[PDB]
């Protein structure tokens, strides 16, 4: 529970990517989490854990239509900070069947920030990405696949971030 995650949950998406300026699209369509691109600004990046745990279908209404229907999912809600300053709120939902092989490590990642750099033995692909907005702020949701196994990642870009 946290104001930034409430804001993340209020994001309204468009099926079609809006015709935004190139610099903003570069950020929004990045094919990775923001961990390294935020480090690129000359910052240390850390994760503040807001919520970590297994949840059933009733707790993932926004992600359920985009994921396999299973008994359980791993839910990971975080604040991503740059030199301690919150820059993004993230909410990842992982169907438990995706937690196999190298991917079981997703459940024990803890405060290590997500990013392609962690996926040293699996192929990463994205088959869905939509940009959303909530009261002046931008966010996005993506369906990513690791060895073809899906997970949903939703990100809210806080105004402290360089997208603004």
PDB file of C-alpha atoms in Angstrom:
ATOM      1  CA  UNK A   1       0.000   0.000   0.000  1.00  0.00           C
ATOM      2  CA  UNK A   2       1.488   3.387  -0.924  1.00  0.00           C
ATOM      3  CA  UNK A   3       0.312   6.576  -2.660  1.00  0.00           C
ATOM      4  CA  UNK A   4       2.562   5.904  -5.666  1.00  0.00           C
ATOM      5  CA  UNK A   5       1.074   2.428  -6.144  1.00  0.00           C
ATOM      6  CA  UNK A   6      -2.465   3.873  -5.836  1.00  0.00           C
ATOM      7  CA  UNK A   7      -1.496   6.279  -8.649  1.00  0.00           C
ATOM      8  CA  UNK A   8      -0.008   3.391 -10.670  1.00  0.00           C
ATOM      9  CA  UNK A   9      -3.293   1.503 -10.353  1.00  0.00           C
ATOM     10  CA  UNK A  10      -5.269   4.496 -11.658  1.00  0.00           C
ATOM     11  CA  UNK A  11      -3.376   4.667 -14.963  1.00  0.00           C
ATOM     12  CA  UNK A  12      -5.615   4.647 -18.047  1.00  0.00           C
ATOM     13  CA  UNK A  13      -4.124   3.043 -21.135  1.00  0.00           C
ATOM     14  CA  UNK A  14      -4.485   3.517 -24.862  1.00  0.00           C
ATOM     15  CA  UNK A  15      -4.299   0.543 -27.248  1.00  0.00           C
ATOM     16  CA  UNK A  16      -2.338   2.744 -29.662  1.00  0.00           C
ATOM     17  CA  UNK A  17       0.931   4.463 -28.676  1.00  0.00           C
ATOM     18  CA  UNK A  18       0.298   8.272 -28.723  1.00  0.00           C
ATOM     19  CA  UNK A  19       2.302  10.494 -31.085  1.00  0.00           C
ATOM     20  CA  UNK A  20       4.530  11.977 -28.371  1.00  0.00           C
ATOM     21  CA  UNK A  21       7.869  13.729 -28.695  1.00  0.00           C
ATOM     22  CA  UNK A  22      10.755  11.411 -29.585  1.00  0.00           C
ATOM     23  CA  UNK A  23      12.639  11.863 -26.330  1.00  0.00           C
ATOM     24  CA  UNK A  24       9.619  10.864 -24.311  1.00  0.00           C
ATOM     25  CA  UNK A  25       8.914   7.878 -26.560  1.00  0.00           C
ATOM     26  CA  UNK A  26      12.508   6.780 -26.273  1.00  0.00           C
ATOM     27  CA  UNK A  27      11.920   6.408 -22.502  1.00  0.00           C
ATOM     28  CA  UNK A  28       8.427   4.905 -22.716  1.00  0.00           C
ATOM     29  CA  UNK A  29       9.214   2.309 -25.295  1.00  0.00           C
ATOM     30  CA  UNK A  30      12.590   1.276 -23.780  1.00  0.00           C
ATOM     31  CA  UNK A  31      13.016  -2.457 -24.141  1.00  0.00           C
ATOM     32  CA  UNK A  32      14.175  -3.003 -20.524  1.00  0.00           C
ATOM     33  CA  UNK A  33      13.253  -1.892 -17.001  1.00  0.00           C
ATOM     34  CA  UNK A  34      14.550   1.564 -16.093  1.00  0.00           C
ATOM     35  CA  UNK A  35      17.361   0.393 -13.794  1.00  0.00           C
ATOM     36  CA  UNK A  36      20.311   0.938 -16.096  1.00  0.00           C
ATOM     37  CA  UNK A  37      18.895   3.987 -17.915  1.00  0.00           C
ATOM     38  CA  UNK A  38      18.366   5.610 -14.538  1.00  0.00           C
ATOM     39  CA  UNK A  39      21.947   4.711 -13.517  1.00  0.00           C
ATOM     40  CA  UNK A  40      22.902   6.346 -16.854  1.00  0.00           C
ATOM     41  CA  UNK A  41      21.830   9.720 -15.422  1.00  0.00           C
ATOM     42  CA  UNK A  42      24.701   9.391 -12.929  1.00  0.00           C
ATOM     43  CA  UNK A  43      22.755   7.870 -10.053  1.00  0.00           C
ATOM     44  CA  UNK A  44      22.848   4.903  -7.716  1.00  0.00           C
ATOM     45  CA  UNK A  45      19.573   2.956  -8.075  1.00  0.00           C
ATOM     46  CA  UNK A  46      17.912   1.102  -5.229  1.00  0.00           C
ATOM     47  CA  UNK A  47      14.626  -0.581  -4.576  1.00  0.00           C
ATOM     48  CA  UNK A  48      12.208   0.126  -1.734  1.00  0.00           C
ATOM     49  CA  UNK A  49       9.885  -2.864  -1.366  1.00  0.00           C
ATOM     50  CA  UNK A  50       6.285  -1.924  -0.966  1.00  0.00           C
ATOM     51  CA  UNK A  51       4.728  -5.384  -1.261  1.00  0.00           C
ATOM     52  CA  UNK A  52       6.119  -8.868  -2.057  1.00  0.00           C
ATOM     53  CA  UNK A  53       4.061 -12.073  -1.862  1.00  0.00           C
ATOM     54  CA  UNK A  54       1.865 -14.695  -3.481  1.00  0.00           C
ATOM     55  CA  UNK A  55      -1.676 -13.602  -4.399  1.00  0.00           C
ATOM     56  CA  UNK A  56      -4.706 -15.228  -5.995  1.00  0.00           C
ATOM     57  CA  UNK A  57      -6.697 -14.062  -9.062  1.00  0.00           C
ATOM     58  CA  UNK A  58      -8.902 -11.666  -7.152  1.00  0.00           C
ATOM     59  CA  UNK A  59      -5.858  -9.494  -6.380  1.00  0.00           C
ATOM     60  CA  UNK A  60      -4.760  -8.960 -10.003  1.00  0.00           C
ATOM     61  CA  UNK A  61      -7.808  -7.728 -11.876  1.00  0.00           C
ATOM     62  CA  UNK A  62      -5.884  -5.427 -14.207  1.00  0.00           C
ATOM     63  CA  UNK A  63      -3.319  -8.104 -15.112  1.00  0.00           C
ATOM     64  CA  UNK A  64      -5.549 -11.206 -15.206  1.00  0.00           C
ATOM     65  CA  UNK A  65      -6.799 -10.702 -18.783  1.00  0.00           C
ATOM     66  CA  UNK A  66      -3.225 -10.501 -20.032  1.00  0.00           C
ATOM     67  CA  UNK A  67      -1.872 -13.530 -18.170  1.00  0.00           C
ATOM     68  CA  UNK A  68      -2.510 -17.298 -17.982  1.00  0.00           C
ATOM     69  CA  UNK A  69      -5.316 -18.150 -15.519  1.00  0.00           C
ATOM     70  CA  UNK A  70      -3.688 -19.907 -12.548  1.00  0.00           C
ATOM     71  CA  UNK A  71      -4.162 -20.464  -8.850  1.00  0.00           C
ATOM     72  CA  UNK A  72      -1.456 -18.120  -7.760  1.00  0.00           C
ATOM     73  CA  UNK A  73       0.847 -15.293  -8.826  1.00  0.00           C
ATOM     74  CA  UNK A  74       3.895 -13.644  -7.340  1.00  0.00           C
ATOM     75  CA  UNK A  75       3.235  -9.910  -6.782  1.00  0.00           C
ATOM     76  CA  UNK A  76       6.130  -7.483  -6.438  1.00  0.00           C
ATOM     77  CA  UNK A  77       5.395  -3.755  -5.850  1.00  0.00           C
ATOM     78  CA  UNK A  78       8.305  -1.363  -5.528  1.00  0.00           C
ATOM     79  CA  UNK A  79       9.569   2.186  -5.498  1.00  0.00           C
ATOM     80  CA  UNK A  80      12.677   2.580  -7.668  1.00  0.00           C
ATOM     81  CA  UNK A  81      15.007   5.287  -6.278  1.00  0.00           C
ATOM     82  CA  UNK A  82      17.913   7.272  -7.797  1.00  0.00           C
ATOM     83  CA  UNK A  83      20.303   8.425  -5.053  1.00  0.00           C
ATOM     84  CA  UNK A  84      17.428   7.750  -2.661  1.00  0.00           C
ATOM     85  CA  UNK A  85      14.915   9.796  -4.543  1.00  0.00           C
ATOM     86  CA  UNK A  86      11.795   7.942  -5.760  1.00  0.00           C
ATOM     87  CA  UNK A  87      11.645   8.034  -9.587  1.00  0.00           C
ATOM     88  CA  UNK A  88       9.258   5.205 -10.447  1.00  0.00           C
ATOM     89  CA  UNK A  89       6.738   2.842  -8.919  1.00  0.00           C
ATOM     90  CA  UNK A  90       6.658  -0.664 -10.356  1.00  0.00           C
ATOM     91  CA  UNK A  91       4.213  -3.551 -10.035  1.00  0.00           C
ATOM     92  CA  UNK A  92       5.151  -6.946 -11.422  1.00  0.00           C
ATOM     93  CA  UNK A  93       2.794  -9.907 -11.543  1.00  0.00           C
ATOM     94  CA  UNK A  94       4.288 -13.287 -12.264  1.00  0.00           C
ATOM     95  CA  UNK A  95       2.015 -16.312 -12.889  1.00  0.00           C
ATOM     96  CA  UNK A  96       3.558 -19.072 -10.718  1.00  0.00           C
ATOM     97  CA  UNK A  97       4.074 -21.393 -13.727  1.00  0.00           C
ATOM     98  CA  UNK A  98       6.617 -18.818 -14.974  1.00  0.00           C
ATOM     99  CA  UNK A  99       8.634 -19.472 -11.781  1.00  0.00           C
ATOM    100  CA  UNK A 100      10.592 -22.443 -13.146  1.00  0.00           C
ATOM    101  CA  UNK A 101      14.240 -22.861 -14.084  1.00  0.00           C
ATOM    102  CA  UNK A 102      16.270 -19.636 -13.915  1.00  0.00           C
ATOM    103  CA  UNK A 103      13.038 -17.769 -13.518  1.00  0.00           C
ATOM    104  CA  UNK A 104      12.246 -19.153 -10.051  1.00  0.00           C
ATOM    105  CA  UNK A 105      14.773 -16.543  -8.922  1.00  0.00           C
ATOM    106  CA  UNK A 106      12.134 -13.855  -9.540  1.00  0.00           C
ATOM    107  CA  UNK A 107      10.502 -14.730  -6.265  1.00  0.00           C
ATOM    108  CA  UNK A 108      13.709 -14.195  -4.264  1.00  0.00           C
ATOM    109  CA  UNK A 109      15.016 -11.088  -6.049  1.00  0.00           C
ATOM    110  CA  UNK A 110      14.176  -8.919  -3.055  1.00  0.00           C
ATOM    111  CA  UNK A 111      15.582  -5.412  -3.262  1.00  0.00           C
ATOM    112  CA  UNK A 112      17.743  -6.191  -6.327  1.00  0.00           C
ATOM    113  CA  UNK A 113      16.239  -3.995  -9.107  1.00  0.00           C
ATOM    114  CA  UNK A 114      14.863  -5.859 -12.109  1.00  0.00           C
ATOM    115  CA  UNK A 115      16.592  -5.519 -15.467  1.00  0.00           C
ATOM    116  CA  UNK A 116      17.838  -7.481 -18.480  1.00  0.00           C
ATOM    117  CA  UNK A 117      21.230  -7.650 -16.796  1.00  0.00           C
ATOM    118  CA  UNK A 118      19.858 -10.350 -14.424  1.00  0.00           C
ATOM    119  CA  UNK A 119      18.612 -12.672 -17.208  1.00  0.00           C
ATOM    120  CA  UNK A 120      21.988 -14.209 -18.043  1.00  0.00           C
ATOM    121  CA  UNK A 121      20.662 -17.508 -19.469  1.00  0.00           C
ATOM    122  CA  UNK A 122      17.129 -16.846 -20.774  1.00  0.00           C
ATOM    123  CA  UNK A 123      15.886 -14.981 -23.841  1.00  0.00           C
ATOM    124  CA  UNK A 124      13.712 -11.946 -23.089  1.00  0.00           C
ATOM    125  CA  UNK A 125      10.985 -10.815 -25.477  1.00  0.00           C
ATOM    126  CA  UNK A 126       8.052  -8.399 -25.185  1.00  0.00           C
ATOM    127  CA  UNK A 127       4.802  -9.042 -26.903  1.00  0.00           C
ATOM    128  CA  UNK A 128       2.638  -6.250 -25.522  1.00  0.00           C
ATOM    129  CA  UNK A 129       3.231  -2.641 -24.460  1.00  0.00           C
ATOM    130  CA  UNK A 130       0.773   0.155 -23.851  1.00  0.00           C
ATOM    131  CA  UNK A 131       1.320   3.698 -22.537  1.00  0.00           C
ATOM    132  CA  UNK A 132      -1.012   4.992 -19.827  1.00  0.00           C
ATOM    133  CA  UNK A 133      -1.627   8.274 -18.050  1.00  0.00           C
ATOM    134  CA  UNK A 134      -2.952   9.425 -14.658  1.00  0.00           C
ATOM    135  CA  UNK A 135      -3.360  13.082 -13.751  1.00  0.00           C
ATOM    136  CA  UNK A 136      -0.380  14.523 -15.625  1.00  0.00           C
ATOM    137  CA  UNK A 137       1.888  11.492 -15.079  1.00  0.00           C
ATOM    138  CA  UNK A 138       2.926   8.817 -17.597  1.00  0.00           C
ATOM    139  CA  UNK A 139       3.071   5.086 -17.019  1.00  0.00           C
ATOM    140  CA  UNK A 140       3.139   1.935 -19.144  1.00  0.00           C
ATOM    141  CA  UNK A 141       2.349  -1.771 -18.952  1.00  0.00           C
ATOM    142  CA  UNK A 142       4.197  -4.540 -20.763  1.00  0.00           C
ATOM    143  CA  UNK A 143       3.878  -8.280 -21.077  1.00  0.00           C
ATOM    144  CA  UNK A 144       7.393  -9.693 -21.063  1.00  0.00           C
ATOM    145  CA  UNK A 145       8.493 -13.240 -21.712  1.00  0.00           C
ATOM    146  CA  UNK A 146      11.533 -15.091 -20.268  1.00  0.00           C
ATOM    147  CA  UNK A 147      12.047 -18.383 -22.149  1.00  0.00           C
ATOM    148  CA  UNK A 148       8.585 -17.680 -23.482  1.00  0.00           C
ATOM    149  CA  UNK A 149       7.026 -17.602 -19.984  1.00  0.00           C
ATOM    150  CA  UNK A 150       5.033 -14.463 -19.311  1.00  0.00           C
ATOM    151  CA  UNK A 151       4.951 -11.804 -16.660  1.00  0.00           C
ATOM    152  CA  UNK A 152       3.301  -8.422 -16.489  1.00  0.00           C
ATOM    153  CA  UNK A 153       5.254  -5.299 -15.574  1.00  0.00           C
ATOM    154  CA  UNK A 154       3.460  -1.990 -14.917  1.00  0.00           C
ATOM    155  CA  UNK A 155       5.560   1.180 -14.338  1.00  0.00           C
ATOM    156  CA  UNK A 156       4.530   4.696 -13.144  1.00  0.00           C
ATOM    157  CA  UNK A 157       7.038   7.466 -13.876  1.00  0.00           C
ATOM    158  CA  UNK A 158       7.184   9.828 -10.944  1.00  0.00           C
ATOM    159  CA  UNK A 159       7.695  13.499 -11.733  1.00  0.00           C
ATOM    160  CA  UNK A 160      11.157  13.444 -10.196  1.00  0.00           C
ATOM    161  CA  UNK A 161      12.214  11.204 -13.102  1.00  0.00           C
ATOM    162  CA  UNK A 162      13.937  12.663 -16.228  1.00  0.00           C
ATOM    163  CA  UNK A 163      10.904  12.016 -18.435  1.00  0.00           C
ATOM    164  CA  UNK A 164       9.579  15.349 -17.236  1.00  0.00           C
TER     165      UNK A 164
END
